[PDB]
Subunit: 117 residues, 4 copies
Amino acid sequence: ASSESPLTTHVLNVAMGVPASNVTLRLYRQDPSSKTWQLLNTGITNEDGRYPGLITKELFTAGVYKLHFETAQYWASLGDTSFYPYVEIVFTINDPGQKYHVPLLLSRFSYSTYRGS
Amino acid sequence: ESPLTTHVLNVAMGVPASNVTLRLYRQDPSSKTWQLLNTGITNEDGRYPGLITKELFTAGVYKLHFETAQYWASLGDTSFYPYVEIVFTINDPGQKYHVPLLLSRFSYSTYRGS
Amino acid sequence: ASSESPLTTHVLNVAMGVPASNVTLRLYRQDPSSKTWQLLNTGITNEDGRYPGLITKELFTAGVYKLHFETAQYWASLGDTSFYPYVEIVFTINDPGQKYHVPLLLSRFSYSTYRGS
Amino acid sequence: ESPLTTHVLNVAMGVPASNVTLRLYRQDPSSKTWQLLNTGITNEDGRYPGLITKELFTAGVYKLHFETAQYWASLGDTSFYPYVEIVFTINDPGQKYHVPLLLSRFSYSTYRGS
């Protein structure tokens, strides 16, 4: 197969039509018993708005995951205010045998996400 | 009071998209061309009251056409889409249909609202 | 003026083209010093997917707010699985003199939001 | 290797939209009509490799047309949009352009991707 992470993301700046590079992100998984969030990885998006290596196949077990993006810091770095201090996407992985692509389409006053591929 | 309504939002700036030229058409089943029904410009809230009278809202396929690149040019910007058309089926002349359009320079989205 | 709440929402089930009624939601505001979240209101969306009275004008002061929607419970009530256990939208109110409309467009495998009007 | 790519996702079900008929046009500047360039059907990943050769990717206005209602009918469903057209400006024949389309029965979204 491929050595790419089974969970991937892609942040697009839809206001300017370019990848959102330099966005700080963090990945967590919830403890099903305590409901607390365990930090698994942190990163900054690359020039194509992606973050290779978000998680390894070994650690991508079934559970509830959270991706957290520092959206206001991204817009501030471009000199702009924005509506959302950060964006969190919380999602259920029942079958860790699949690939999951979790993109984020961003403007200063809107965002959207989907289970892409 | 029009059964068909719209609402255009500038989601890059978080404001209604005012002063957007729009045109409404119905597909002509004979000629297989688009029959123009109305033209106007969105108001300060990005809406256009009075798009069509209930008496003319027959079942069929309709098209809303929005002059999106002209809008962004009026704000001093370029953009990816010369215009945006939404083609949709009205099968119940007795229901209300709301057709929002969310715009940025490099994306757009639409849905049946309420 | 109007006696409507200055903050409003509208949840649309875009898979079926109808308002998402019966969705449990909760509104919080963050303490700027402790960073903790204070619960301000809870509600269930109505037949039009809205929740009148989310907050009063008196209590809608400047700050960081969070709307939390019980999305998986909504889909489960329709007999469907879905990707997101819940959705949170975190947003900055610097000028509480404005109206803020914070809609949520929902399907089982996608959602989007914007600062509407 | 086509400089123009697409990707159609069924966001209601969280899967690629396979078997969607699409057509690519370029606006004809003389006749002011749409010139058909290519037709095909999305693959199992919702993509269509080979939409246009670089030699034919000249600057201009292009249209991608997707047979959305036929797709939902193939899944046993009705839907609001007979088809979806995305009309976009290519001003740099040397760049790559990716044009995703996100579909549900009652919404759609598009953006310039990467």
